[PDB]
Amino acid sequence: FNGLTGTGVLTESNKKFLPFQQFGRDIADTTDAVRDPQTLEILDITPCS
Amino acid sequence: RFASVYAWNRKRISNCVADYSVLYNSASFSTFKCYGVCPTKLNDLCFTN
């Protein structure tokens, strides 16, 4: 993406972001979900099994 | 059109891509030093401001 480099499984998110947030964070301070720079879908990042 | 230092100017760079490709390696500069990101990685990053 724009950074937030990592490995995981991207699925559609049921989240909404405020227009200026781009991505979120978990309690562990890891990215929870990101907005796709193109088309702006929010994708949840789950761990790989 | 460089400014007097007492009244240094500033321009915003936005909505554009690249030219962080170690331009300093042209050796037209007497010095080049980064205080954040190591110079060779600037061209791999995204910025907001």
Add this chain to the structure above:
Amino acid sequence: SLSSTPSALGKLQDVVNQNAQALNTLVKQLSSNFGAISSVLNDILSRLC
């Protein structure tokens, strides 16, 4: 008596709560910098040489 008083089984609930707190404290130390420029390894690697 057991149905009526919620504190009746506090001795077992306390064990559960202590263990939950330990795990919910351990995952939060991941957000700490510990003097590092960032709590996230991926940010260190994408920006520094």
